[PDB]
Amino acid sequence: FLKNNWVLLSTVAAVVLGITTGVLVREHSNLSTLEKFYFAFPGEILMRMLKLIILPLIISSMITGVAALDSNVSGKIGLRAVVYYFATTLIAVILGIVLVVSIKPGVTQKVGEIARTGSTPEVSTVDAMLDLIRNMFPENLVQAAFQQYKTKREEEYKIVGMYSDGINVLGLIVFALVFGLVIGKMGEKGQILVDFFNALSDATMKIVQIIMWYMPLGILFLIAGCIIEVEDWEIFRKLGLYMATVLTGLAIHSIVILPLIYFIVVRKNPFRFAMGMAQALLTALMISSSSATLPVTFRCAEENNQVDKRITRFVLPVGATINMDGTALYEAVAAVFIAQLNDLDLGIGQIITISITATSASIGAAGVPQAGLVTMVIVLSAVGLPAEDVTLIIAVDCLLDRFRTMVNVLGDAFGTGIVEKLSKKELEQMDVS
């Protein structure tokens, strides 16, 4: 069974051992705030090794995927992917809103009992909405690789902007799409660029395999460190009802709705397909970064489910930044919970508008240093409540952030399969013309 299955067995063993190690250390030992940071050094090294692959992999994969297809074919695949993402995001938002209202988590609990912590960021609705369009078209290609644009209101008020560290993935993806479309129609005059980017994509994909050898140790030291820096278990019991709603919504959306759509569109068993990405699911659960888990998703989808490369290379990078299913559901549930906690009554129109604004703001903060805080604040401002009540959820915002990634990755795989099957005619016809 070994060699055939070594990476998955090592990852499972490391995940099992890390929880035990972390529980034992915290229980029977006392560590200072400085000593708790040196215990997670291998995890940080793994995190900053995985962050180094995102730029070349994304750029080369997007260019290669776009340039391979014809101009007429690419638009149809993009339209299908966009429609599927939008529809399932709407479905997830609806499911989350109804689920939190039905159970009624914050009817009994009062705001006074619950403590709060964290720093609420400064947020402007229209400014944040326009910052997305600004970041879609960066002023500099080199600066876009490690900086982002932000604007703030100051002084009867003026608008001033500045650049801050953080990879701009939206602008890079848009430019890669445009460049691939341009060089795909040049014919012979762009073949050198096509070959260069194909070789770069292959070389980048071969480097992740080296990191996969060190991955189990970093995973073991990464999950143990999360169970040593936990503040206390009092807040977990004080917020147990809140976590139940989000977890139930995520589980329902992952188990019922997505396989239902997959079985309706394509006539295949949807559970073996999900099993084929188990390593990707564990990677998403631990690292909890949809962008950093991209190479593992590529390897799992292409090698284990026989999905066409020309479909993954175009769909998966796009889905790495645009899919908002987990984010939108969590934000909607948390906003309704905060509204229930305070003296606010939710009507039908209020529910509809809060769902609409949650759906819009989930994708509005597509790329932000702390996007979960921006989206919640916008929804709370829309409903009336201030941004100072977001600090209640921050105490458990490190546990529910990990669960969303696996759902997003699994849904991206399902959408890749659905889009590949939905355009089978042009995939079997472009091979000869």
Author numbering: 14 to 168, 199 to 476
Verbatim from the authors:
Human excitatory amino acid transporters (EAATs) concentrate the neurotransmitter glutamate and aspartate in cells. By coupling the uptake of one substrate molecule to movements of five ions—symport of three sodium (Na+) ions and a proton and countertransport of one potassium (K+) ion—EAATs ensure that the cytoplasmic glutamate concentration is ~10 mM, which is required for neuronal functions, while the extracellular concentrations are as low as a few nM permitting rounds of synaptic signaling. EAATs are homotrimers composed of promoters that work independently. TMs 1, 2, 4, and 5 of each protomer comprise the scaffold domain mediating trimerization; TMs 3, 6, 7, and 8 and helical hairpins (HPs) 1 and 2 form the substrate-binding transport domain.
EAAT3-X was predominantly found in OFS in NaCl buffer and iOFS in NMDG, NaCl/glutamate, and KCl buffers. Surprisingly, when we examined the OFS conformations imaged in the NMDG chloride and KCl buffers, we found that they closely resembled OFS-Na+ with wide-open HP2 gates. We observed no density in the K+-binding site, suggesting that potassium did not bind to OFS even though it was present at 300 mM. We term these nearly identical structures (RMSD 0.57 Å) OFS-ApoNMDG and OFS-ApoK and refer to them collectively as OFS-Apo for short. Strikingly, the YE/DDR motifs of OFS-Apo are in the bound configuration, while their NMD motifs are in a configuration intermediate between apo and bound conformations. Inspection of the Na3 sites in OFS-ApoNMDG and OFS-ApoK revealed distorted geometries of the ion-coordinating residues, including shifted N366 sidechains. In contrast, in OFS-Apo and OFS-Na+, E374 is buried and proximal to G415. It is likely protonated with pKa-s of 9.2, 10.0, and 7.6 for OFS-ApoK, OFS-ApoNMDG, and OFS-Na+, respectively. OFS-Apo features an open HP2, protonated E374, and bound-like NMD and YE/DDR motifs.
